[PDB]
Amino acid sequence: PGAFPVATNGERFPWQELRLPSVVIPLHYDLFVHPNLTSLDFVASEKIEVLVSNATQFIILHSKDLEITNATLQSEEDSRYMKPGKELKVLSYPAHEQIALLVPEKLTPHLKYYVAMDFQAKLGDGFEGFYKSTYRTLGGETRILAVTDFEPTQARMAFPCFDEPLFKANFSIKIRRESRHIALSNMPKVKTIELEGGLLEDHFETTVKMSTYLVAYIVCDFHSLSGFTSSGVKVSIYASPDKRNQTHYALQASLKLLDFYEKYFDIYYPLSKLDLIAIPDFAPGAMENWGLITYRETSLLFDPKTSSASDKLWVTRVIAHELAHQWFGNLVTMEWWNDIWLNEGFAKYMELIAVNATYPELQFDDYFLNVCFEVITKDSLNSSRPISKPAETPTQIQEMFDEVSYNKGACILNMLKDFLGEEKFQKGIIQYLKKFSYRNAKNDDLWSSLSNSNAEVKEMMTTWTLQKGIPLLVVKDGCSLRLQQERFLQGVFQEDPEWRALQERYLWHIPLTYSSSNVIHRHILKSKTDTLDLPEKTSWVKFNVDSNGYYIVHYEGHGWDQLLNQNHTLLRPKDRVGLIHDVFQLVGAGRLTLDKALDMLQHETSSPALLEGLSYLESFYHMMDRRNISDISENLKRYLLQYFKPVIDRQSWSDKGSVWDRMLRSALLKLACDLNHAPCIQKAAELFSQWMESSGKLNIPTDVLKIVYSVGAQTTAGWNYLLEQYELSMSSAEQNKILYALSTSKHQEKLLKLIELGMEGKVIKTQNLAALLHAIARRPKGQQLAWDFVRENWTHLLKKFDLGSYDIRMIISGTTAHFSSKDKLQEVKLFFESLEAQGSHLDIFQTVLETITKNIKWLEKNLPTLRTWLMV
Amino acid sequence: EDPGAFPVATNGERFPWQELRLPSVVIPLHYDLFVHPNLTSLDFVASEKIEVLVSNATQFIILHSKDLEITNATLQSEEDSRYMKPGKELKVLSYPAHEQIALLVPEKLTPHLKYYVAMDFQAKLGDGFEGFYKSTYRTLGGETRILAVTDFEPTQARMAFPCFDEPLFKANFSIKIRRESRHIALSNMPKVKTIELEGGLLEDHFETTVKMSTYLVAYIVCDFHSLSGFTSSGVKVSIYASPDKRNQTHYALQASLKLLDFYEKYFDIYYPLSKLDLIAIPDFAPGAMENWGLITYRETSLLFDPKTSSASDKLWVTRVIAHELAHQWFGNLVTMEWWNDIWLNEGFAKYMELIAVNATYPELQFDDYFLNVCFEVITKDSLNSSRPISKPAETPTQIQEMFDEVSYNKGACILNMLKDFLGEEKFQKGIIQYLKKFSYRNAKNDDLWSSLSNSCLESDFTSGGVCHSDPKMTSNMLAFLGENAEVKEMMTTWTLQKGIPLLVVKQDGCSLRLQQERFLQGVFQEDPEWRALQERYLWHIPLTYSTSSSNVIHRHILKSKTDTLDLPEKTSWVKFNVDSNGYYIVHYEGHGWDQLITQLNQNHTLLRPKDRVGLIHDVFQLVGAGRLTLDKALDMTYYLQHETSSPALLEGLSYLESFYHMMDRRNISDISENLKRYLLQYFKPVIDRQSWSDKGSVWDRMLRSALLKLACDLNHAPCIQKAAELFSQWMESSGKLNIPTDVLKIVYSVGAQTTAGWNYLLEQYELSMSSAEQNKILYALSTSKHQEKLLKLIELGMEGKVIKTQNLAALLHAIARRPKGQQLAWDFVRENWTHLLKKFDLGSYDIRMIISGTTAHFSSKDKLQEVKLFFESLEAQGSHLDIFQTVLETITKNIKWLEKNLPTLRTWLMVNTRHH
Ligand SMILES: *[C@@H]1O[C@H](CO)[C@@H](O[C@@H]2O[C@H](CO)[C@@H](O[C@@H]3O[C@H](CO[C@H]4O[C@H](CO)[C@@H](O)[C@H](O)[C@@H]4O)[C@@H](O)[C@H](O[C@H]4O[C@H](CO)[C@@H](O)[C@H](O)[C@@H]4O)[C@@H]3O)[C@H](O)[C@H]2NC(C)=O)[C@H](O)[C@H]1NC(C)=O
Ligand SMILES: CC(C)C[C@H](NC(=O)[C@H](Cc1cc(-c2ccccc2)cc(-c2ccccc2)c1)CP(=O)(O)[C@@H](N)CCc1ccccc1)C(N)=O
Ligand SMILES: CC(C)C[C@H](NC(=O)[C@H](Cc1cc(-c2ccccc2)cc(-c2ccccc2)c1)CP(=O)(O)[C@@H](N)CCc1ccccc1)C(N)=O
Ligand SMILES: *[C@@H]1O[C@H](CO)[C@@H](O[C@@H]2O[C@H](CO)[C@@H](O[C@@H]3O[C@H](CO)[C@@H](O)[C@H](O)[C@@H]3O)[C@H](O)[C@H]2NC(C)=O)[C@H](O)[C@H]1NC(C)=O
Ligand SMILES: *[C@@H]1O[C@H](CO)[C@@H](O[C@@H]2O[C@H](CO)[C@@H](O)[C@H](O)[C@H]2NC(C)=O)[C@H](O)[C@H]1NC(C)=O
Ligand SMILES: *[C@@H]1O[C@H](CO)[C@@H](O[C@@H]2O[C@H](CO)[C@@H](O)[C@H](O)[C@H]2NC(C)=O)[C@H](O)[C@H]1NC(C)=O
């Protein structure tokens, strides 16, 4: 009997596992909220029409930090619980964030009973649940709004509910409010009824079946700009009144993208309205609430006096990602958080399609390669995880929202789009959605639908979704296709006794694909060793075409050395950087050395190739200047300026030209005075002080703003003028760049004053705190200050953030993942074991542990080689 | 004119007038003023049409204008057809050093004809809490809201609209405002009608005012809420506050109805407007401002909340409200001709606080506190740096310097003296005739005395008329006119002679030799500068005196520098200045003082309660005068063991409390420690009778706080442990349990001695919704002992975000008076003088107390040196203030007091510990 947990009233709680029981099933939530924005609290009532199916003496559902005052169980059918119904005993067990409704009788199956509850709480101050946010206006008034953010386990802090994504229901919502506020929610507002006190109550149309984590409601004081999509949907971009000017690109871009998705998926967006609102203190980048999409202001609003081409590119990506979610996640959602990549993998992949086919000017296809690359860094260590993987606690579910779920989800999806061909792919995607509309899909179900566009493909992708890591292609004599696959790793060489893990079951059904002329050959590799015959022999032979496959190519002999250092356009531009990328991880990996590492092309015109390789050189400089040895840094510095002096001088300090043109300019001039190369750092200072002496009158071109501001930080008369003007500005894009601009100063106290105002949270919003730290810790001057500060104020940072939070995740790897010493590796082994003193376990612990360990062993056996490039 | 070499206007261009006063050839009659502020762009746009009457023909009009962009300016007339509609364009000349503009006339204007001058002007909303400025407050939710407020006195109306900014240029004002949906607009007079406009903006029209000086014009744009009620005469009194504070305006409404009703019966003149608005502005520099029909207050001056406001707080709010309402007659109905006679306003409003509060709220017992008003001004009036009540003044900072202890306190005190001389009903009818005979115009000093002199006692309107219609030539009717004239010469001298007279009386058998001299602290009677300052001083002093044998008040005027009276039968003593109603000190020569102290020591109750507080005040002063040894003043404090009149008790107590702080600043710890022990022993009985909750009278409550603060400032372990518990419980209950208001300040101080309590108090400061509680918390934070915490408060006030700048000077003042922060405040001011000047004008009250509050407590020759050198530094840069001299004289007389009396104080204490 008494094998169960104690409740808060000392009674034993009738359920013992974190997943909810399956016997009670909700169908309909009627939901009343009455928030008060001066009292900063709310009162709320709720009726859940839950259909029983098995005998049960107790209903179980979730609730957190809510005071439940009344709880009644009516029934229309089994009329023992007929009107007024009976009053229910309510037990609470917080360690599973669950409550037990103890019925006095026993519920009997196939009947519908109606659970009503009254509940109340204060508006959150943690930027989760139903919480309070502030914003500044043009005159410096601050006004208050009440927002919801629920993904993934936080809706249970706003109303008691069955808070698992499989428990889809309908949700009618009513909200009481003052006359000076508007109320928005998922659906459009049906009617407004004026009441006794001068208050209004807004009723909203019932929703389609959906998960709890998409329910939304806001109370605020915003204006909007509206337009209509071809389909029959009204799109409104809401924001603070003094920023309605900044909403123009978003309504344009939203109209196109939703037009695209409706035809591309061949499913109409099923709501009458879709609204996009720029929440000023917002923790996520944005959030795919059905019909009411919340954005960070820097993610939605675009001011052409203040915003990069890169910032226009960021806004349009996030407004593709979040519209895509309306199908991947809202229409179809994973049955449980283990297959979270079904929403996020597909959303991040759909963004690449949408922007490419809607905004070609922005040139997003050539950029996409980076996202796999970032996940490959993670995926190449043993700390990584399979794309689908069990997940039970809250903070463990929040761990599933990583670059494995987004980037690698998006890239292995990209692989299969190459193999089956976009035609068969798009038909499969449409069959997948239409089948699973308003329901829940498991990891298997997507492929079992995608395959029938071929029972072969299902176990092919089994190798990719259920197994950790990234395969390695070993090719080995004329027509020599002696294929052998491995598990690519890093910091573990064939020499080492650690390397036996390269052999466990690690067998990928890699869909290899090649060319030795302008034609691609396609063939599967389902075994450790298999092979082919070359038709005739050729100069070079390259497999990974455009790196569209999630594997790195290693030619076992005499193939690398050709690379065409004279005519490079023999090999296509994507394969150009594909080869560049592969010829550094192979260096770290253990097979190749660094002498061929710097092999690469001062006459490369595709900037993707140019920036990718040069960004690779940036890392070498920074990693060495961070340990303060100029013996290898100075050679890297003016090497890059002399050799890349033509290109650098060509650029014209203004925001003119095309998008990769404009991005190449700021990227190039970044280094240009991140190096104290006078010709241009001197340039900034006269523009800088022309503007600083103009006092907001001079206009600086877009693509140089972050550079100019950054340059003029060092003079305290500037740094103090930048901080002061930060407060004044009405562009979150502009003030982000200022905030970077103040992280550049090398004054240890000026740096920490920035951090002190973040902790306070009023002048610099708390949403920016982690990024502010992360910027500082990247400079060598502030690198140790940040590391010190986090360890000194840990318990306070943890009171701000949820610890499965992204801010906590970005603060620790932002402060530690750039280390390369054995000194710091033990010191970070401590304080990770110091925080498992408390119940604080995060996989990012090992990912960063192993990441500094791989930084040691890449200096341990690779730097001697690179001192050897002194020129003169 | 002939000579080109005139002042040079700002565009080249010789400027055609060069006095700072305005010319009186053009007379304004009626201003048509349209204002359109915008509270999200923080600027305003305005238009104005002044109906002027020309007296002598000119080629130019001279106006005041400061910091206002004028865009165009026409002239029209309909009596002079040359400027017939649409009139002519005028050249505008700015001379921004006189704050004057000149409008240049194309054809010289004609006498006796009315013209209309029209200008468009614009400016940003002020930032210095003067002119038409921007203010902000915080709501319960944490929102920040903006409002736009005017404050003009004394010469800032010219920063909001061009005008003839001098008090004698009264006019009617017609005011239209334009605003958004979410704001109300208030002005002096009621809103006649609200027209809607295309775009959804509304325009308010207000009824046109009665004649009025410019400095009283007012207008406000905000979103405040109001509670309302009506007086007996049918005035609509409304209390406005930020919306989450409507609660705290109930007591204000209750008192303003009562006080208004009192004023209308007492003056026998109705308040002439239909409504009176009282509004609690959050970021407000002055404290209160008596604009006709729309009176602005500091929240602490107007709002009351019983859970956090003390009884002292309640008394303060009643005083201020009473004070502002008095101004609607004294100052608005009757305005001084020019700022030299500003005491005609502030002296009478100050005095009327006493009459009104005493008449409507006797529970407050404000009559027993009124003596302190006169003591505070005798401090400064007994120095050479003092000034007469009415002195000339010309420049803006020169004008504002006239609002001091002399204009207010001395003015009130000599009025009170005069009232006792003539009797309440004679005095009332003098006032009534004055206010009725100068209604809607101005008056000067001589005008007041002539009306108060010629007052008629209501039986002078009888059948056998003595004042009016047909008098009989009687022998009292020859004494009436002779007595009236005597009263006028006497009052004249009290307003033109600086200083305060010292009447020294030696009792000789049953003769009594009277002498008068100027009273002077610091300087002894045996000083080389002492006959040089007894120059020419001579007062007509209506004296008063009782005896040991007869309690009948005797009254004789001394106009003669020496004179003598004879009594009926030589009694055991005489006591001059009965109830201390006279603006003079009385020194008893020979045996006079011991006879009076001996009386207090056996049966102290035969001396009238005010006689006692007067006697305590009189000898501690005479110690400073060199005429008495500190011996017998301290010997008078024995007898406070029996004293039951808290006024006398508290006077005596505070002299000893200040000696302690004087020692503690100087680190003279053996006396300071002894002073701690004498106070705690000799007043142990009455200290432990005091409750720790606010349960008795207002005096009982005020005495409770007084004594408990003292016992807790002397680290009396029993009282400090009580307060530490109370604080600990309050902190442990999430700042949610209730502390009694009379001991609230003491508890927050004891809590602020730990870094925990200090930090907790500082975060509660930002969150509190009672500005009385915030005041108390800020004091408590300022009692910290760590120099780091004190500096943080100061710099918090410099930035003005969590601590609003309106409190910065009181903050510095608080820090400076306690030993561990005395030095820090001094260094801050000298190292940030240029920085303090950007926020506050040189003549502002804020600058006055920052200076006096950090320096006037110094008592060593070393510190006098630094102060002179700093003051010299300041005046070398062109900053002169009268406060510089006043501080220097105050410092030196402190130094002298230590040198003549610190030995005797140490000696006395030790003698007392040997006896008890
Ligand atoms: C969130 O919470 C805030 C604060 O709790 C609420 O704001 C308050 O709401 C209350 C209730 O509506 C408001 O109080 C009301 O004010 C009205 C206006 O008062 C002025 O005008 C009247 C008429 O001229 C004058 O009599 C009065 O003195 C003021 O000049 C009153 O009319 C209301 O009175 C009603 O209720 C009382 C109850 O005793 C009855 O006796 C009356 O006859 C009448 O029926 C009432 O007092 C208050 O003003 C609000 N505060 C603020 C700061 O605005 C929000 O409503 C709430 N929001 C939500 C969404 O819940
Ligand atoms: C992904 C995590 C961290 C949760 C949350 N993701 C979002 O913001 C995305 C958009 C986004 C993604 C990323 C990103 C992707 C992959 C791997 C690392 C990071 C960075 C940013 C970013 C960059 C700069 C500045 C600010 C943000 C933005 C909206 P989304 O995926 O469409 C919504 N539906 C998911 C909701 C959610 C789930 C669980 C916890 C919190 C929120 C968040 N904190 O970054
Ligand atoms: C005194 C000057 C500078 C203006 C202003 N006086 C007022 O607030 C009075 C009431 C008042 C008076 C005093 C006071 C009296 C005597 C000698 C020194 C000071 C102190 C306070 C006080 C108490 C606590 C906190 C803050 C202030 C209040 C309203 P009032 O007299 O009816 C209106 N006539 C004055 C308008 C004005 C005139 C000239 C310059 C500025 C404003 C002010 N700053 O103290
Ligand atoms: C400017 O303000 C003055 C106040 O200083 C206003 O004076 C007042 O004007 C009204 C109307 O003209 C007078 O009321 C009238 O009095 C006569 C008695 O002769 C009566 O028969 C009328 O029916 C009415 O009651 C009032 O007495 C007068 N007060 C004073 C003190 O002069 C003046 O009207 C204002 N001017 C403008 C243009 O608004
Ligand atoms: C009602 O619930 C009972 C008990 O949970 C169900 O019986 C279970 O059914 C599952 C379904 O797969 C079986 O695996 C188990 O053997 C049964 N018992 C338990 C303890 O799980 C029953 O099927 C449910 N549905 C009805 C009665 O319609
Ligand atoms: C709950 O949501 C479901 C799914 O969105 C609603 O079902 C649709 O109902 C409409 C109107 O009755 C029909 O035209 C569709 O055929 C239904 N779609 C599906 C997939 O069944 C349902 O009506 C909603 N319930 C409530 C009470 O609003």
Ligand SMILES: *[C@@H]1O[C@H](CO)[C@@H](O)[C@H](O)[C@H]1NC(C)=O
């Ligand atoms: C590296 O050298 C610089 C030279 O200024 C020094 O200031 C810095 O502290 C050094 N870094 C470390 C980690 O010792």
